[PDB]
From Swiss-Prot:
Keywords from the named record: Disulfide bond, Pharmaceutical, Protease inhibitor, Secreted, Serine protease inhibitor, Signal
Record's function text: Inhibits trypsin, kallikrein, chymotrypsin, and plasmin.
Cystine pairings recorded for this chain: C5-C55, C14-C38, C30-C51
Site residues by UniProt (Reactive bond for trypsin): K15, A16
Superkingdom assignment: Eukaryota
Molecular function via GO: calcium ion binding; molecular function inhibitor activity; potassium channel inhibitor activity; protease binding; serine-type endopeptidase inhibitor activity; sulfate binding; zymogen binding
Compartmental location: Secreted
BPTI/Kunitz inhibitor domain mapped to chain residues: 5-55
The name this protein goes by in its record: Pancreatic trypsin inhibitor
One term under GO cellular component: serine protease inhibitor complex
Amino acid sequence: RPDFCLEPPYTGPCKARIIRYAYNAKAGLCQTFVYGGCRAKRNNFKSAEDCMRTCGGA
């Protein structure tokens, strides 16, 4: 699981309400969050499994 999988989901400064997934290191699973629509960081995925294939474990 790469380093950016541990960094909190960044909404960003734009004001859209779009639902994306980000890995949640405390649960060990990906959970949704609201992306504002610009300047996506890496822990920002468009399905639960893309998130887990990148940020998941064994």
